[PDB]
């Protein structure tokens, strides 16, 4: 019965790793990764999570099942992290949150929930977007469309072209927004554009679906959430998928939440129960480890202070590197003006190199980027910074 | 958009917990649970897993993403646990295994994989079966049918009636077998009946789907697998979902694997890639914690020896309790002959009480069982054993 089965197509991101872990050139550099790396080239366990894990090892007495929605604490801290302390939404009991296996698990859960309990048929995802967004949505049965976003020429957010592509979006359609650090491009709407996008959404009838995967990496934990909070203020409904994989360095523990907000308590509840049933037919209940670690940190003044600083360092390292990158080029040749790399947020951004320029980089020079010219800035160190720009300038 | 949403129906198993955690009667007893409990009424963390977790805390240097299939070690030990050491299947490179979030996550993953890459439309699950089996299958789009199993009158496995219901099963149909400790009833096919069921499956063209959730609880780790191994010997294809939640007491860490076997290397591989793509659109990659704990134990002679003993104790406690149960009744009144409870395997079995007898138990006497009359034997202790049978005999 499996003899007819077709090879699944490689992922070139997940498929890119291999040739790196096969190349030999000494200079070898991997800027196609999706995780953060410190100045020494490693993806360390935060000190704060190591402390929370010792606590757990000592205080855990059972590994019995969590509820289907996970750890209550975890759910609350998330809501507070996302919407804020004295939020009208939290006080009105308008939000229910489900602990989920990774930001990805949250997306799929919203997907299966939306797919089977509502009349949603389409989801619009920004033009360049995290490639896996589409696949998560298709597998639920939903159709994915694309709205315009990135100005190929100006390396900016085309606000008009974006809106112009969102008028073809009808009422009960789900629009997907990246809360901060746009995954492929790093270009984020300003606060005025989020307020504008919020208003259009209210009039037009769209159902917002926020993907928060890097809270804390553009400007901070609170600032990074103003857009999401601009919508939360005028919308009666919205869904939000967050991940704690990149901001807690908890990648393989699968920590993320899927938050659902309705018009009032009775509704978020009724709707939440169907969400529970979706989870229940998927993985049954969430993995306690990484999430126990996050509830513990966030609810301990001591540990939380340390984590904030660890987040801040990470964020500051990337900012140190975007700047050092746009400079070393200016010194080592650099035809073009890469000044745009600066103030593009998060670990990524499009270099703007052609697909053929990337190949040449990876083949002669041994620098590994995603064919889209997307580079992970956190994979740059002061040490490899120089050969890196020298091999880029050697291709334009 | 969520105002039309319908209340999801309660789970009465997951919905049964509540009224227990609300009742007041001192004598209060919960035999409707799904987890194991020791003689003191607790679900402890094994000593072996506590040791493996200290190891991890000390030796882990990163929490970076696992592959989509998880931890290789974990995959190998599983294969060896399931098929055996010098297995033709392992040596021929005929099996690929994916670490998954719980036995439930494995089921869904097989489900989405089967749903989208094969011409499977139906799945047959034993008559009384783990209720969540159906929901996992429906959500993939597959249809669930039911084959006969349990002799209401004899408290036995109706071998004929079973087979008689499996002739309506056509060629590319998936038949689901519980490898050991049938979830609701505890009745397991003997080795001759597994060999017979294997042969029928080969001639008729069915695709076996084994659900192993209690390996080690009926007779042992190896014996519990002879059925599965009887099929593995004649089948060119078969799928197996295993869970490590009940045998490692790792309930909330979501540890389970989804094993896929094809006719040969090239095929299991091609097919495996599509399975990877299913996982990839679901949760992206598996939680490392509970699975790291299992690879570490299983690959350490010291720790594995301790675990085996802990498994053996659990298994022996349940056997001590089935026997003590069928006896205390014989002493305290007992109309009927419950001698059938003895040598019914695992933590469960049907008491054979009518749905109205269960209600009366739970309402007057404060004993909590699932309406199907299913009782968890591991929730019985020598201490509560006496009031328990006294309140049962008070209802017949
Ligand atoms: C990383 C990422 C996710 C997936 O998160 P996991 O937490 O690893 O599942 C989802 N969305 C975006 C935009 C991401 O960058
Ligand atoms: C417990 C159980 C499962 C689910 O296992 P988890 O590992 O908790 O997902 C699946 N199948 C059967 C028969 C079970 O008893």
From Swiss-Prot, chains A, B:
Effect of residue 133 to N: Decreases to 60% in maximum rate of the overall reactions in both directions
Cofactor field: pyridoxal 5'-phosphate
PROSITE patterns according to UniProt: AA_TRANSFER_CLASS_1
Known uses: Has been used to construct a 2,4,6-trinitrotoluene (TNT) biosensor strain.
Catalytic activity: L-aspartate + 2-oxoglutarate = oxaloacetate + L-glutamate
E.C. no: 2.6.1.1
One GO cellular component, as annotated: cytoplasm
Phenotype for residue 374 to F/Y: Second-order rate constants are reduced by >5 orders of magnitude
SUPFAM superfamilies reported in the protein's UniProt record: PLP-dependent transferases
Keywords (A to Z) from UniProt: Aminotransferase, Cytoplasm, Pyridoxal phosphate, Transferase
Family as reported in the entry's similarity comment: Belongs to the class-I pyridoxal-phosphate-dependent aminotransferase family.
Record's subunit section: Homodimer.
Protein name from the UniProt record: Aspartate aminotransferase
């Amino acid at each position: 019965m499996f003899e007819n089965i077709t090879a699944a197509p490689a992922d070139p991101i997940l498929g890119l790793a291999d040739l790196f872990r096969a190349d030999e050139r000494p200079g070898k550099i991997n800027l196609g990764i999706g995780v953060y790396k410190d100045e020494t080239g490693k993806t360390p366990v935060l000190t704060s999570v190591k402390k929370a894990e010792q606590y757990l090892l000592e205080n855990e007495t059972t590994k019995n099942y969590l509820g289907i929605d996970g750890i209550p604490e975890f759910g609350r801290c998330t809501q507070e992290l996302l919407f804020g302390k004295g939020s009208a939404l939290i006080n009105d009991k308008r939000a229910r949150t489900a602990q989920t296996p990774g930001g990805t698990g949250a997306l799929r859960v919203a997907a299966d929930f939306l797919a089977k309990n509502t009349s949603v048929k389409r989801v619009w995802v920004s033009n360049p977007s995290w490639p896996n967004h589409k696949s998560v949505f298709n597998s639920a049965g939903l159709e994915v469309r694309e709205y315009a976003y990135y100005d190929a020429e100006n390396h900016t957010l085309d606000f008009d072209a974006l809106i112009n592509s969102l008028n073809e979006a009808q009422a009960g359609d789900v629009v997907l927004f990246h809360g901060s650090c746009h995954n492929p491009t790093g270009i984020d709407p300003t606060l005025e554009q989020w307020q504008t996008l919020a208003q259009l959404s209210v009039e037009k009838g769209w159902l917002p679906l926020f993907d928060f995967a890097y809270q804390g990496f553009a400007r901070g934990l609170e600032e990074d959430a103003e857009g999401l909070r601009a919508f939360a203020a005028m919308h009666k409904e919205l869904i939000v998928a967050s991940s704690y994989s990149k901001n807690f360095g908890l990648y393989n523990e699968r920590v993320g939440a899927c938050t659902l907000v309705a018009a009032d308590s009775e509704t978020v509840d009724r709707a939440f129960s169907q969400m529970k049933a979706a989870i229940r037919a998927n993985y049954s209940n969430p993995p306690a480890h990484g999430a126990s670690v996050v509830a513990t940190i966030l609810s301990n003044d001591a540990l939380r202070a340390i984590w904030e600083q660890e987040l801040t360092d990470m964020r500051q390292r990337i900012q140190r590197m975007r700047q050092l990158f746009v400079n070393t080029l200016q010194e080592k040749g650099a035809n073009r003006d890469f000044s745009f790399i600066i103030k593009q947020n998060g670990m990524f951004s499009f270099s703007g190199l052609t697909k053929e320029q990337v190949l040449r980089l990876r083949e002669e020079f041994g620098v590994y980027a995603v064919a889209s010219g997307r580079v992970n800035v956190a994979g740059m160190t002061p040490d490899n910074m120089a050969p890196l720009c020298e091999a880029i300038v050697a291709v334009l």
